[PDB]
Amino acid sequence: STEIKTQVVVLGAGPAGYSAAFRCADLGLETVIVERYNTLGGVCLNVGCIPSKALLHVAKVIEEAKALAEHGIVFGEPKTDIDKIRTWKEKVINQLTGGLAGMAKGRKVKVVNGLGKFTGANTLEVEGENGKTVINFDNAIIAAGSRPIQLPFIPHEDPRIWDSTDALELKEVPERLLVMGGGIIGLEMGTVYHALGSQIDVVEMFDQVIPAADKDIVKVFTKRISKKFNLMLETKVTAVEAKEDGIYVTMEGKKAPAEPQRYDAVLVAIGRVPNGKNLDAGKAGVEVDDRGFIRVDKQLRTNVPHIFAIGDIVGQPMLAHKGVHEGHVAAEVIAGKKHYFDPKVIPSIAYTEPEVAWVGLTEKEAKEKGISYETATFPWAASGRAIASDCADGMTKLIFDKESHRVIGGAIVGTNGGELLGEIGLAIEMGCDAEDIALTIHAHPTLHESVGLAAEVFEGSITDLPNPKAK
Amino acid sequence: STEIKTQVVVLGAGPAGYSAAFRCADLGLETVIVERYNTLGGVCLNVGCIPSKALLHVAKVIEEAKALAEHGIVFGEPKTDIDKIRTWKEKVINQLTGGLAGMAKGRKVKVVNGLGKFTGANTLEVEGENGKTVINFDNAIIAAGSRPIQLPFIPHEDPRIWDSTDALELKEVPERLLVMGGGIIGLEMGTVYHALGSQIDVVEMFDQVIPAADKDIVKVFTKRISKKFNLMLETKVTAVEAKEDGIYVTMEGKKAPAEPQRYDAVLVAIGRVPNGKNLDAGKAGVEVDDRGFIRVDKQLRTNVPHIFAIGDIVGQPMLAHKGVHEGHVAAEVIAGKKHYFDPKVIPSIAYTEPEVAWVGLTEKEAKEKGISYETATFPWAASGRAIASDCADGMTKLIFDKESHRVIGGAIVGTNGGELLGEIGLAIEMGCDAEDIALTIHAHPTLHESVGLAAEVFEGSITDLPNPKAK
Numbered sequence: 015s016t017e018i019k020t021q022v023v024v025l026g027a028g029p030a031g032y033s034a035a036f037r038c039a040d041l042g043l044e045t046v047i048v049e050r051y052n053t054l055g056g057v058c059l060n061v062g063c064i065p066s067k068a069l070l071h072v073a074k075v076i077e078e079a080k081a082l083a084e085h086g087i088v089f090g091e092p093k094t095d096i097d098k099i100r101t102w103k104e105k106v107i108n109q110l111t112g113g114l115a116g117m118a119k120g121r122k123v124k125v126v127n128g129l130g131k132f133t134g135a136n137t138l139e140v141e142g143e144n145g146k147t148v149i150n151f152d153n154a155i156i157a158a159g160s161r162p163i164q165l166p167f168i169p170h171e172d173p174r175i176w177d178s179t180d181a182l183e184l185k186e187v188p189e190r191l192l193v194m195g196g197g198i199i200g201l202e203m204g205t206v207y208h209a210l211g212s213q214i215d216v217v218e219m220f221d222q223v224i225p226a227a228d229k230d231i232v233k234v235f236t237k238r239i240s241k242k243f244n245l246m247l248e249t250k251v252t253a254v255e256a257k258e259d260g261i262y263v264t265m266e267g268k269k270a271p272a273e274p275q276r277y278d279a280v281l282v283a284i285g286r287v288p289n290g291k292n293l294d295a296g297k298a299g300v301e302v303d304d305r306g307f308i309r310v311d312k313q314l315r316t317n318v319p320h321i322f323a324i325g326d327i328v329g330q331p332m333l334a335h336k337g338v339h340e341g342h343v344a345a346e347v348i349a350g351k352k353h354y355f356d357p358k359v360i361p362s363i364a365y366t367e368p369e370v371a372w373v374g375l376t377e378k379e380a381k382e383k384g385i386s387y388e389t390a391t392f393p394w395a396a397s398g399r400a401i402a403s404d405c406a407d408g409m410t411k412l413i414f415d416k417e418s419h420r421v422i423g424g425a426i427v428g429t430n431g432g433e434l435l436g437e438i439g440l441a442i443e444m445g446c447d448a449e450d451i452a453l454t455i456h457a458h459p460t461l462h463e464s465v466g467l468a469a470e471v472f473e474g475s476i477t478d479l480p481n482p483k484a485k
Numbered sequence: 486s487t488e489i490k491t492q493v494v495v496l497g498a499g500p501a502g503y504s505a506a507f508r509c510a511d512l513g514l515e516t517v518i519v520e521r522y523n524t525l526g527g528v529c530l531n532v533g534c535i536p537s538k539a540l541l542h543v544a545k546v547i548e549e550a551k552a553l554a555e556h557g558i559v560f561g562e563p564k565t566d567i568d569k570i571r572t573w574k575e576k577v578i579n580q581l582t583g584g585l586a587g588m589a590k591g592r593k594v595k596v597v598n599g600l601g602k603f604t605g606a607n608t609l610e611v612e613g614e615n616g617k618t619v620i621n622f623d624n625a626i627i628a629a630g631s632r633p634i635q636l637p638f639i640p641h642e643d644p645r646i647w648d649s650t651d652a653l654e655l656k657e658v659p660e661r662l663l664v665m666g667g668g669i670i671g672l673e674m675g676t677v678y679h680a681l682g683s684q685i686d687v688v689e690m691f692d693q694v695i696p697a698a699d700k701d702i703v704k705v706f707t708k709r710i711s712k713k714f715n716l717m718l719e720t721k722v723t724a725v726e727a728k729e730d731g732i733y734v735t736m737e738g739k740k741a742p743a744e745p746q747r748y749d750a751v752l753v754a755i756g757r758v759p760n761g762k763n764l765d766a767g768k769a770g771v772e773v774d775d776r777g778f779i780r781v782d783k784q785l786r787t788n789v790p791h792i793f794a795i796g797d798i799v800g801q802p803m804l805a806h807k808g809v810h811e812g813h814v815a816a817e818v819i820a821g822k823k824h825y826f827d828p829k830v831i832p833s834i835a836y837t838e839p840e841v842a843w844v845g846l847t848e849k850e851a852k853e854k855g856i857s858y859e860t861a862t863f864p865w866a867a868s869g870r871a872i873a874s875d876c877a878d879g880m881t882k883l884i885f886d887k888e889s890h891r892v893i894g895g896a897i898v899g900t901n902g903g904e905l906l907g908e909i910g911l912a913i914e915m916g917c918d919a920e921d922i923a924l925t926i927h928a929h930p931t932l933h934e935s936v937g938l939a940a941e942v943f944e945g946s947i948t949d950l951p952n953p954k955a956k
């Protein structure tokens with residue numbers, strides 16, 4: 015029963031949403047953000063990328079410290095206080111949310127807290143702390159994100175059945191943990207809890223973890239990870255039963271045990287689904303597909319031209335950077351600029367150890383597309399830096415169009431591997447060929463020089479590896 | 486004496502030398518390498534880049550392990566065995582040497598061990614393990630490297646007066662160590678020994694460590710390091726005297742103490758000089774300058790057209806990657822290709838913690854060149870990744886031509902900062918502008934996305950910082 019009139023309303027304050035809102039404000043538009051939770055930053059900041067990366071950094075340091083022992087530096091076994099780790103995680107998060115609130119204030123962007131739902135083509139109704147707020151807008155930006163997949167046969171109401179948020183709460187270190195899903199989130203959480211002392215089982219229906227990534231990359235990764243996790247591929251969960259002494263899980267498939275297994279906790283990390291069906295978007299005339307996605311064009315417009323949608327809710331890949339860039343474009347289009355969201359590439363990174371990172375076309379995709387392509391790889395066993403840094407199990411891979419010589423894809427498996435994507439990404443966006451990359455002088459000794467070296471393998475000029483293109 | 490005939494003789498088996506030799510072989514030329522010492526890889530592999538990076542990795546892990554205590558993971562004080570660390574260092578060197586030997590064998594490149602000197606324009610004489618060998622060549626490639634600077638008033642015959650090789654031998658951990666020279670090598674060794682327990686003093690004649698780098702970058706580094714090291718800037722060593730209980734060093738300048746200071750060891754890391762005067766190059770008609778450089782053109786030719794020179798011995802910067810690329814060009818030119826060595830940029834990295842890395846023009850150089858430029862920086866205090874990884878003091882800086890918007894230089898201070906140079910390097914080589922970089926989608930949350938964000942700061946679209954370019 016309180017009414018507001020604004021130019022732009024943004025539904026959701028995640029990466030996509032707040033980036034869109036801030037861009038609108040910087041472009042001189044009157045902008046209001048609606049968010050059901052009490053802080054900004056959405057899933058990414060509060061229960062996603064950031065806390066997971068904090069805990070993963072902790073895990074990495076623990077394992078490195080232990081790995082120093084054979085080289086003459088012996089730390090004891092660490093004394094660990096989970097409450098303190100949790101407190102630190104919360105500190106990084108609170109620092110960042112404080113930052114976002116500060117920036118919203120600085121850009122004079124009003125934040126309305128509560129559940130927003132459309133009531134008309136130009137009207138969004140918010141139910142929150144201050145009662146009901148009716149927001150009349152010229153433009154709306156839908157950025158309401160996604161949520162974890164739940165399965166009907168699983169008692170998701172038992173506290174020992176976790177999703178990613180539960181896992182990131184760090185309630186305890188379960189003696190035995192099952193991760194359902196060999197995707198990125200599952201493997202990352204597995205990494206975290208393994209470093210803390212948990213015994214890790216991973217169950218995955220596909221024949222490979224991180225299924226979109228190439229076989230050769232994932233092979234290095236799997237070789238590394240099979241020493242610490244019990245990987246059960248091409249296997250599925252058929253039943254989950256809560257009992258007093260634990261969660262009993264029945265599996266069927268190639269690596270399934272005969273008997274149901276007892277776990278102290280089960281992380282259900284099957285995937286995520288969009289929140290498009292929860293907005294009464296139809297009342298604004300907006301089309302929502304059967305899977306809950308709100309599909310948009312290259313200017314991020316829904317079927318209703320003055321209503322935009324960005325981020326996870328718009329489609330895959332569900333990644334923060336995609337949402338940020340989409341938000342920027344939507345804001346710019348609303349401001350009247352003729353901009354489009356049409357990136358050649360979108361990078362993906364699994365912050366496991368070693369990291370698995372890739373951008374552009376994978377070899378799988380290249381073979382299905384049927385274009386003449388050639389791969390070039392540099393093994394980290396040949397890298398001075400990787401050996402000197404005790405991380406020789408890695409590989410840098412570039413994929414080239416055979417005729418044009420343009421780089422069309424790249425991948426790294428290795429410590430700090432993700433940090434190498436930038437160059438590759440830039441290279442693809444600029445339409446670089448192998449010669450461009452190879453002739454650029456990369457610093458030695460670094461991990462990223464492998465990018466250059468891979469290019470050299472293609473050029474046939476490589477001298478840090480045997481050169482089969484020699485004569 | 487034994488006499489042999491070859492197409493190409495390469496004097497020196499360092500990065501430059503073996504890269505040139507391997508490239509010549511890959512191009513179908515009969516090739517012989519001459520090396521006075523019994524190992525391959527030269528300074529870089531044996532007493533330079535590789536061992537220093539190994540020890541620095543050890544130091545970094547020790548410090549991170551200690552830093553976890555504040556977050557709830559408490560390792561004890563480490564129990565350290567210096568003999569075992571040294572053994573590990575030696576192991577990385579040996580593995581890599583083995584690799585190089587394997588590659589030389591595979592390319593059918595013969596290695597003649599001994600001291601090489603020119604006797605004529607087409608004759609090089611080697612005195613070595615297999616006696617004296619006379620090599621008649623069509624082309625020679627001089628790659629005989631550099632050596633540490635010594636000072637006449639310093640008793641360099643005392644075992645407590647070190648150069649970098651001594652430091653890398655790791656014979657003991659001196660309670661108190663003086664590093665003379667605030668260059669990269671000195672700071673790296675200071676980092677290693679501080680991590681091992683040494684108290685570190687650094688003397689530098691200039692008003693900043695790493696004088697070649699911009700002041701703001703080094704300011705960020707200096708703030709981190711001034712708590713761990715006693716930095717004496719604008720200070721000079723006037724006397725060094727060996728006594729029974731230690732080495733007494735007298736210094737003058739603003740933060741130098743009045744009285745001579747006692748150190749258990751002194752590392753002399755003032756710089757390196759080329760080995761050009763020690764080859765009898767004059768007997769081949771080759772011109773050597775007064776300080777020992779053998780100056781060369783863009784095809785790496787000396788004043789004698791069939792004689793080439795590459796690496797440290799030809800000029801600054803004395804870095805491995807420069808030498809490798811020069812070696813490739815020299816080999817290609819000898820094979821009859823119209824190739825040139827003329828890179829737009831050559832990257833530099835100090836592997837301190839945080840790392841200090843830069844490529845292209847610094848602000849000093851841009852001013853000195855008279856270019857109208859604009860800088861754009863992203864502070865790591867605003868990076869989710871840097872905060873979550875406990876490395877928030879960093880900074881990423883891009884320098885753009887103000888009119889063309891082309892990137893002309895870049896720099897990073899921060900953990901893993903060096904790994905970010907590749908993208909920047911590539912961007913400058915490709916003549917990218919701020920928009921090219923900004924519109925490339927960088928993965929979140931990473932350290933390298935800062936590069937993209939820095940570009941956004943220039944473009945005026947940044948939403949992860951306040952945007953003073955806003956409307």
Ligand SMILES: Cc1cc2nc3c(=O)[nH]c(=O)nc-3n(C[C@H](O)[C@H](O)[C@H](O)COP(=O)(O)OP(=O)(O)OC[C@H]3O[C@@H](n4cnc5c(N)ncnc54)[C@H](O)[C@@H]3O)c2cc1C
Pocket residue numbers: 025026027028029030031048049050051055056057058059061062063066128129130131157158159160178199289292293324325326327332333334335337363929930
């Ligand atoms: C554990 C985990 C790790 C991840 N790791 C990475 C990673 O490393 N890199 C990466 O790029 N991505 C990662 N992701 C995914 C990343 O978090 C998402 O892609 C990103 O958060 C999407 O941003 P968004 O703005 O589209 O949606 P969200 O971040 O989900 O924001 C949507 C916001 O809208 C609010 N909202 C929803 N409905 C309403 C409503 N009706 N009214 C008002 N407010 C509403 C929600 O509360 C939420 O704050 C990870 C995700 C998880 C769960």
Ligand SMILES: Cc1cc2nc3c(=O)[nH]c(=O)nc-3n(C[C@H](O)[C@H](O)[C@H](O)COP(=O)(O)OP(=O)(O)OC[C@H]3O[C@@H](n4cnc5c(N)ncnc54)[C@H](O)[C@@H]3O)c2cc1C
Pocket residue numbers: 458459496497498499500501502519520521522526527528529530532533534537599600601602628629630631649670760763764795796797798803804805806808834836
């Ligand atoms: C401690 C330290 C750290 C360093 N860190 C880095 C770094 O991080 N990154 C980087 O890029 N660079 C670094 N450098 C420098 C790098 O090591 C050199 O730039 C590189 O080794 C130069 O290669 P080169 O082939 O030109 O010379 P060298 O590697 O010195 O090779 C010359 C070789 O020729 C031999 N030789 C000399 N005279 C004769 C003769 N008359 N007959 C036969 N053989 C002869 C020598 O024994 C030597 O093996 C570092 C150097 C040091 C000392």
Ligand SMILES: [Cl-]
Pocket residue numbers: 250251252
């Ligand atoms: Cl299932």
Ligand SMILES: [Cl-]
Pocket residue numbers: 256257258
């Ligand atoms: Cl029961």
